[PDB]
Design a protein around this ligand. Structure first.
Ligand code: 9F7
Length: 238
């Protein structure tokens, strides 16, 4: 996160750190608890991931230093990537991780509500991008979960900013015209959380941008409202 501040413990209890084990263990991406056995993340996070056997999901984490060999995690049973996904810049940058075990809900780990279909018309004014990513382009993964309040941007205004790209309605952008606050390397997969009627909703999944927090370069996010039916299709399968 660029231009953010340290989160407080329990502030984003749906936030998870998705770690890879091959060749050595390291943070890979962010993610959101959306069900007791479901993590919603970005499809691009699995580039060169041969099996879910190398993945470890950590919930209830504020500081990456909380993770050692004795720290408990959730194994990943299945990786479900949207089958229209080619690359982040083309959209469909959404994936579901089905966990081997059930998440025990408490004040340190709980699900974020998905946006309602009737909430496609609502205008969110309190949105936050969270993660353990870089504070600038050439940096390192942060120990403490960072947060940044970012304004939502119209598809039209985002399309002006990304000439040469096709910004679809399945994408949602966020950022200040002058930059300064944004997601960066290590944040992808994580949430873009918006508070509405005292209820947090998963509006976006951190996807891509040209650089980090640049003037007139909004962060591009997967527009979760547009994938509610795809999420239910995979999580509610008979
Ligand atoms: C499959 C491989 C995965 C995802 C690749 C894409 C991802 N993009 C992002 O995380 C965010 C992009 C982005 C998103 C928005 Cl919304 C706006 C502006 C953005 N950026 C544009 N240029 N940089 N960031 C990214 N993550 C890292 C570098 N780049 C990264 C850095 C460090 C570690 N681990 C580490 O040091 O452990 C000790 C792990 C990763 N993970 C990855 O390599």
């Amino acid at each position: 996160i660029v231009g953010g501040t340290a989160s407080v413990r329990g502030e984003w209890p749906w936030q998870v750190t998705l770690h890879t084990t091959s060749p050595t263990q390291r943070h890979l991406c962010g993610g959101s608890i959306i069900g007791n056995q479901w993590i919603l993340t970005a499809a691009h996070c699995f580039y060169g991931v041969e099996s879910p056997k190398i993945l470890r999901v950590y919930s209830g984490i504020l500081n990456q230093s909380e993770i050692k060999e004795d720290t408990s995690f959730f194994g990943v049973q299945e990786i479900i990537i949207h089958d229209q996904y080619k690359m982040a810049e083309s959209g469909y940058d959404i994936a579901l991780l089905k966990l081997e075990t059930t998440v025990g809900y408490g004040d340190s780990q709980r699900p974020i509500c998905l946006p309602s279909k009737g909430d496609r018309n609502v205008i969110y004014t309190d949105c936050w991008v969270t993660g353990w990513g870089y504070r600038k382009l050439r940096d390192k993964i942060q120990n403490t979960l960072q947060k940044a309040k970012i304004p939502l941007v119209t598809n039209e205004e985002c399309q002006k900013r990304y000439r040469g790209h096709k910004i679809t309605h399945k994408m949602i952008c966020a950022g200040y015209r002058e930059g300064g606050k944004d997601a960066c390397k290590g944040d992808s997969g994580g949430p873009l959380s918006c508070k509405h009627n005292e209820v947090w909703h998963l509006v976006g999944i951190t996807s891509w941008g040209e650089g980090c927090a640049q003037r007139e370069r909004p962060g591009v996010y997967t527009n979760v409202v547009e994938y509610v039916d795809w999420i239910l299709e995979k999580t509610q399968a008979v």
